[PDB]
């Protein structure tokens, strides 16, 4: 059956903050993409250090020294060779729809989400 | 087989927004539900004026006074009866993927993209 590297978005098309950027530049960053999700970076774009869903970012309007360090969730990276079928029944009953997808030997391959998945099933049916 | 009103998330179900409402009562709102997208209203929850992407408010922390009903982009319509594979095309041909669900009109729910193709992977 298919795998996660047949319809994984490939590292170089990744959209990913760096936590480094002040606030105005990461909201004129996420606000250029239309996604709702970015994997954040420090230091080397593999240097991931989780996830930010963007709307949390509104936060900023309710906490008065908010740091967006706070609001970078783990990510979840999943292997290459995971096969969709899977995949699908762990992101249906998980919080995160979008993991991090990593390679044979840990390298960060690109990533992934459940969207991909479902239309890469409907596609084979 | 199978139509949009078999799959559709219940008027009940639907994260609605209130485009009158003040700022920090739509944040509040926004911040604790887990959509991305919100069907807005003015006046009458049946009035369903357009829809909102949560991340374009993030534009409000760049211009605090804008009018925010410059950041609602307009909904589409769809009839219950309508058919999953006719909506599914309709879809992929398409960059919006959320519709307000009209029945036999008043409004009756709501169907994503998602929606459809769950559906259609638990008919295999
Ligand atoms: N940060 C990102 N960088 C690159 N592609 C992404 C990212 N987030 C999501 N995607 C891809 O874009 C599609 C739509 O996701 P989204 O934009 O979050 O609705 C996903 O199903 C993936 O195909
Ligand atoms: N504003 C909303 N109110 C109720 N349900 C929604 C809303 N937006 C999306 N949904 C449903 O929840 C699923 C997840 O969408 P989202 O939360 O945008 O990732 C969709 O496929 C719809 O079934």
């Given at each position: ?7 994984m978005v490939?590292?170089?098309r990744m ?8 606030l ?10 239309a ?9 080397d774009?593999?240097?991931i250090?989780?996830?930010l869903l963007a ?12 740091d ?7 990510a ?15 992101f249906?009953?998980?919080?995160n ?29």
């Amino acid at each position: 059956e298919r795998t996660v590297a047949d319809i994984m978005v490939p590292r170089s098309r990744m959209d990913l903050l760096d936590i480094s950027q002040p606030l105005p530049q990461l909201l004129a960053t996420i606000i250029e993409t239309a996604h709702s999700r970015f994997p954040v970076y420090e230091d080397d774009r593999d240097n991931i250090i989780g996830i930010l869903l963007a709307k949390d970012l509104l936060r900023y309007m309710l906490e008065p020294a908010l740091d967006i360090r706070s609001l970078v969730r783990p990510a979840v990276f999943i292997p290459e060779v995971k096969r969709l079928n899977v995949l699908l029944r762990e992101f249906r009953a998980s919080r995160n729809h979008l993991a991090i997808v990593i390679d044979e030997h840990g390298g960060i391959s690109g990533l992934v989400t459940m969207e991909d998945v479902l239309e890469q099933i409907v596609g084979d049916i």
